[PDB]
Design an enzyme around this catalytic site. Structure first.
Site, PDB file in Angstrom:
ATOM      1  N   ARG B  65       0.869  -1.022   0.225  1.00 19.24           N
ATOM      2  CA  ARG B  65       0.085   0.096  -0.080  1.00 19.24           C
ATOM      3  C   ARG B  65       0.992   1.281  -0.045  1.00 19.24           C
ATOM      4  O   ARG B  65       0.396   2.206  -0.324  1.00 19.24           O
ATOM      5  CB  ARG B  65      -1.050  -0.169   1.078  1.00 19.24           C
ATOM      6  CG  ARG B  65      -2.072  -0.897   0.999  1.00 19.24           C
ATOM      7  CD  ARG B  65      -3.054  -0.816   1.808  1.00 19.24           C
ATOM      8  NE  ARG B  65      -2.754  -1.626   3.200  1.00 19.24           N
ATOM      9  CZ  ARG B  65      -3.320  -2.628   3.549  1.00 19.24           C
ATOM     10  NH1 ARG B  65      -3.998  -3.286   2.784  1.00 19.24           N
ATOM     11  NH2 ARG B  65      -3.052  -3.150   4.792  1.00 19.24           N
ATOM     12  N   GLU B 102       1.538 -10.296  12.627  1.00 23.41           N
ATOM     13  CA  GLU B 102       0.468 -11.419  13.324  1.00 23.41           C
ATOM     14  C   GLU B 102       1.332 -12.285  14.015  1.00 23.41           C
ATOM     15  O   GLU B 102       1.993 -11.900  15.047  1.00 23.41           O
ATOM     16  CB  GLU B 102      -0.154 -11.952  12.069  1.00 23.41           C
ATOM     17  CG  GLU B 102      -1.027 -10.783  11.298  1.00 23.41           C
ATOM     18  CD  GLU B 102      -1.844 -11.516  10.056  1.00 23.41           C
ATOM     19  OE1 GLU B 102      -2.093 -12.855  10.198  1.00 23.41           O
ATOM     20  OE2 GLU B 102      -2.094 -10.764   9.081  1.00 23.41           O
TER      21      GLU B 102
HETATM   22  O1  IMP Z   1      -5.373  -0.965  10.292  1.00 26.82           O
HETATM   23  C1  IMP Z   1      -4.913  -1.110   9.312  1.00 26.82           C
HETATM   24  N1  IMP Z   1      -5.191  -0.593   8.093  1.00 26.82           N
HETATM   25  C2  IMP Z   1      -4.508  -0.832   7.003  1.00 26.82           C
HETATM   26  N2  IMP Z   1      -3.032  -1.694   6.991  1.00 26.82           N
HETATM   27  C3  IMP Z   1      -2.658  -2.116   8.124  1.00 26.82           C
HETATM   28  C4  IMP Z   1      -3.691  -1.734   9.140  1.00 26.82           C
HETATM   29  N3  IMP Z   1      -2.611  -2.219  10.330  1.00 26.82           N
HETATM   30  C5  IMP Z   1      -1.535  -2.813   9.780  1.00 26.82           C
HETATM   31  N4  IMP Z   1      -1.721  -2.453   8.334  1.00 26.82           N
HETATM   32  C6  IMP Z   1      -0.420  -3.017   7.336  1.00 26.82           C
HETATM   33  O2  IMP Z   1       0.504  -3.556   7.867  1.00 26.82           O
HETATM   34  C7  IMP Z   1       1.465  -2.371   7.911  1.00 26.82           C
HETATM   35  C8  IMP Z   1       2.239  -1.719   8.984  1.00 26.82           C
HETATM   36  O3  IMP Z   1       1.641  -2.512  10.294  1.00 26.82           O
HETATM   37  P1  IMP Z   1       3.124  -2.585  11.341  1.00 26.82           P
HETATM   38  O4  IMP Z   1       4.136  -3.565  10.654  1.00 26.82           O
HETATM   39  O5  IMP Z   1       2.592  -3.214  12.691  1.00 26.82           O
HETATM   40  O6  IMP Z   1       3.489  -1.148  11.467  1.00 26.82           O
HETATM   41  C9  IMP Z   1       1.508  -1.654   6.720  1.00 26.82           C
HETATM   42  O7  IMP Z   1       2.107  -2.191   5.640  1.00 26.82           O
HETATM   43  C10 IMP Z   1       0.059  -1.627   6.551  1.00 26.82           C
HETATM   44  O8  IMP Z   1      -0.271  -1.501   5.378  1.00 26.82           O
END
Ligand code: IMP
Ligand code: IMP
Lengths: 173, 178
Positions: B65, B102
């Site tokens: 994204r 996850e």
């Molecule tokens: O609530 C959400 N909406 C959209 N994308 C999310 C959301 N949570 C995590 N992501 C996706 O996972 C990412 C980051 O999650 P992080 O690695 O925990 O910061 C980004 O690449 C987002 O596109």
């Protein structure tokens, strides 16, 4: 075409990737050179406007390399961009199609009768684009055309998409 | 701020996706409304120009994204965009970095020739949550000896403390939710 040359000269071709005998066309340098990226978007936009005039409602970008071009293309046309994702990524009600892999779209991405152009970076077998067209058809959207930067013509993806029209900037066997 | 409002009004929230108790923030409507998308890119570009002047060499967009915003942001700034991809997709010699996503692991990858030592980059993704993804991107870029000036996103989930995870790399988001 000077503009087309700016794009073509930034396609990098890697032999034997991902498997022996196949040549991978890498569009990454197009993104890295702002003049090349602008040329690519300009050429696609001019083609689409010359072919469809004001008939296009949205650009549909394909996950993931379509996402690189879809929004810029849409912006150049004054249009929004809707997204077709790998399955399991979109929230809400969705429709999905397998081709194995699976594509997904939100049920409210488009209303019946809306007209879309699908964009991806490269057309090979046409499996991916074909799946996108089928998904869009199930929302009762009309796919006016699919477009890409690159087409691998010996794989006959164009024939797979027929009767939906297809256009590419550059062709390689 | 009417421009920021154009973005905020096009974030859609989905409770209990992908798991019960959380709220997924969907930026898809920002892309569908061309004024919203233009506002998001403009707000990011204005911030980056106000913070780094002419020092940014490249935008790095994160698969998938971030790819939606990276090239348009790069174009607005007159810059190229380099790509950080999910592992397995890039030809040529690469570097990769794993991080927790996850319950398991994910890996991001970059071409060893994407940047030259010393080049200065801003990383962009749609949303910062735990900061795992952006942290992996910064690690890869650091292994190319690039200088990460800042990471930016449209949305930040502040209760997850991704900003602290990225420190001391600066971070900026347009919108914040718990
Ligand atoms: O609530 C959400 N909406 C959209 N994308 C999310 C959301 N949570 C995590 N992501 C996706 O996972 C990412 C980051 O999650 P992080 O690695 O925990 O910061 C980004 O690449 C987002 O596109
Ligand atoms: O040579 C290649 N270079 C870059 N991407 C490719 C290449 N071949 C296939 N792809 C990717 O796989 C897709 C097309 O595969 P198809 O479904 O066989 O047409 C496009 O979305 C491309 O992003």
């Amino acid at each position: 075409d000077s503009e087309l040359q700016l794009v073509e000269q930034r396609i990098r071709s890697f032999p034997d990737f991902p498997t022996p005998g196949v040549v991978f066309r890498d569009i990454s340098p197009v993104l890295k050179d702002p003049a090349s990226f602008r040329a690519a978007i300009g050429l696609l936009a001019r083609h689409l406007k010359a072919t469809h005039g004001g008939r296009i409602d949205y650009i549909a970008g394909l996950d993931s390399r379509g996402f690189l071009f879809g929004p810029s293309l849409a912006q150049e046309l004054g249009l929004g961009c809707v997204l077709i994702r790998k399955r399991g990524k979109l929230p809400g009600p969705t429709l999905w199609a397998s081709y194995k892999a699976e594509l997904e779209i939100q049920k409210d991405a488009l209303e019946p009768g809306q007209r879309v152009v699908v964009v991806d970076d490269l057309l090979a077998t046409g499996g991916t684009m074909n799946a996108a067209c089928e998904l869009l058809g199930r929302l009762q959207a009309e796919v006016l055309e699919c477009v890409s930067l690159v087409e691998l013509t010996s794989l006959k993806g164009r024939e797979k998409l027929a009767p939906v029209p297809f256009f590419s900037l550059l062709q390689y066997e």
